[PDB]
């Protein structure tokens, strides 16, 4: 009845993939508030 | 039956992916000056 | 027959989001390489 | 049933990527100095 995906891992992994272009561009352009965060910041 | 909704999210979320890159590589392509344009249009 | 995939719209969107990482990631490395490409080298 | 097989190369390239970006936030973590560290191991 289940069908099952034929290809988890690479869609498992696309999630992840882009979720990391969020993540390097949203650096690339808020550098500055990346280096805040490493910076003290947690509290 | 009563499945029946592929992953409409994740492709918008993709799709947006392959967006982020065509604005770094139109970045690093236009750097500052050097620009030379043939004057031809509505003016 | 043919199940066909679940999603070809996803992976179809992985194919390029893999060759982005290859790229951007080659471009840091050998961000000098990328210059001279713009810059001649085609010939 | 001539067909039988997934995507293995799309896949080992994706996790590729999961990993050329774990050396990218690793790189921005290490900047160069400040670094503690406790001595404490065969030494």
């Known amino acids: 009845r289940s069908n099952d995906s034929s290809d ?3 869609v ?3 999630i992840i993939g882009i979720l990391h ?3 390097w561009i949203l ?3 808020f550098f500055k508030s990346i280096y805040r965060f490493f910076e003290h910041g947690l509290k």
Chains 1, 2, 3, 4 share one sequence.
């Open 21 to 23: 272009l969020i993540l």
């Open 8 to 10: 988890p891992l690479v």
């Open 12 to 14: 498992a992994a696309n």
């Open 27 to 29: 650096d690339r352009l």
